[PDB]
Amino acid sequence: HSSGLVPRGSMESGFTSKDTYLSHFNPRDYLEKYYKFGSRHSAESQILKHLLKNLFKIFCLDGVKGDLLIDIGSGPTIYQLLSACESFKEIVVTDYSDQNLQELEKWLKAAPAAFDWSPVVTYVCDLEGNRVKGPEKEEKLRQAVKQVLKCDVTQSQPLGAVPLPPADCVLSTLCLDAACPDLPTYCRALRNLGSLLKPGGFLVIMDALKSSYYMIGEQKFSSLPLGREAVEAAVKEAGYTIEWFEVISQSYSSTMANNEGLFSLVARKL
Numbered sequence: 001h002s003s004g005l006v007p008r009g010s011m012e013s014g015f016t017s018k019d020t021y022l023s024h025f026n027p028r029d030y031l032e033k034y035y036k037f038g039s040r041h042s043a044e045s046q047i048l049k050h051l052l053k054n055l056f057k058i059f060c061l062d063g064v065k066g067d068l069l070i071d072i073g074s075g076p077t078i079y080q081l082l083s084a085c086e087s088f089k090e091i092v093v094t095d096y097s098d099q100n101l102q103e104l105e106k107w108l109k110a111a112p113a114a115f116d117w118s119p120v121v122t123y124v125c126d127l128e129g130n131r132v133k134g135p136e137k138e139e140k141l142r143q144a145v146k147q148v149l150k151c152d153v154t155q156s157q158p159l160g161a162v163p164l165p166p167a168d169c170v171l172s173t174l175c176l177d178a179a180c181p182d183l184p185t186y187c188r189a190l191r192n193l194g195s196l197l198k199p200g201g202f203l204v205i206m207d208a209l210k211s212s213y214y215m216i217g218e219q220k221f222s223s224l225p226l227g228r229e230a231v232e233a234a235v236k237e238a239g240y241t242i243e244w245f246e247v248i249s250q251s252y253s254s255t256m257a258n259n260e261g262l263f264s265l266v267a268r269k270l
């Protein structure tokens with residue numbers, strides 16, 4: 001093993017192996033290290049609020065809406081879907097790592113051991129005008145999530161053999177940097193994801209810029225350090241057109257990730 005020197009599961013290829021996401025990725029540690037939302041003025045909270053505001057604007061003031069939205073690399077998180085469940089009749093959340101989708105499956109049952117998204121749900125409700133309070137928002141979301149599937153962005157069929165109608169949208173937060181060891185792997189995954197999108201559908205990606213790693217405590221995972229133009233071009237060569245592309249300076253703390261901001265885009269398959 002490497003021991004901090006380089007990302008775990010990467011001494012050989014240079015990039016954390018996907019089997020490492022089944023070995024050493026503890027979703028409950030991840031949730032508490034990035035989504036506690038306990039103090040709102042952590043570096044983690046400021047980033048999350050921006051993610052939530054972008055999702056709110058994309059899904060509640062912009063057009064993006066429809067019948068099916070497929071979220072890619074959900075991990076064990078549900079925040080990226082709270083504003084989205086207002087505009088899509090059905091949401092299918094996916095992930096590669098069985099540990100993350102069970103920690104997810106615990107949350108749709110509202111099982112007591114589950115992680116508490118209570119305050120995060122609350123912050124999205126006030127954004128959306130306080131039509132509802134938390135518990136109903138969570139219950140609106142829980143009925144919308146209609147499937148929990150094993151997923152792999154590196155495959156010709158990312159979702160394997162599971163049949164689904166073409167999605168009205170595909171979303172992916174903090175995954176592709178984590179899932180793709182290089183630019184050709186990165187570009188291939190965005191074409192694999194287009195495999196699930198109707199023509200003229202929406203691709204919504206938010207990720208980290210020039211980030212070579214992120215931490216969950218002391219276990220270090222690899223991240224593809226991409227710049228805006230690398231991402232801008234990678235998406236363009238996957239067969240999409242970018243309707244909006246935004247970049248913010250705000251970064252994770254040096255202890256958790258060495259990103260230089262995050263990016264946020266809306267694209268459409270040509």
Ligand SMILES: NC(=O)c1cccc(C#CCN(CC[C@@H](N)C(=O)O)C[C@H]2O[C@H](n3cnc4c(N)ncnc43)[C@@H](O)[C@H]2O)c1
Pocket residue numbers: 018021073074075076077095096097100151152153154173174175177178179208211212213214222223224252257258259
């Ligand atoms: N880039 C940085 O430095 C950085 C900065 C800040 C945070 C993070 C993070 C992170 C964790 N992330 C989920 C987070 C997400 N839903 C969210 O919280 O927003 C990993 C996800 O990708 C895994 N995966 C791995 N291989 C895959 C493959 N081949 N196909 C499909 N999925 C694959 C999944 O297991 C899933 O867990 C990274």
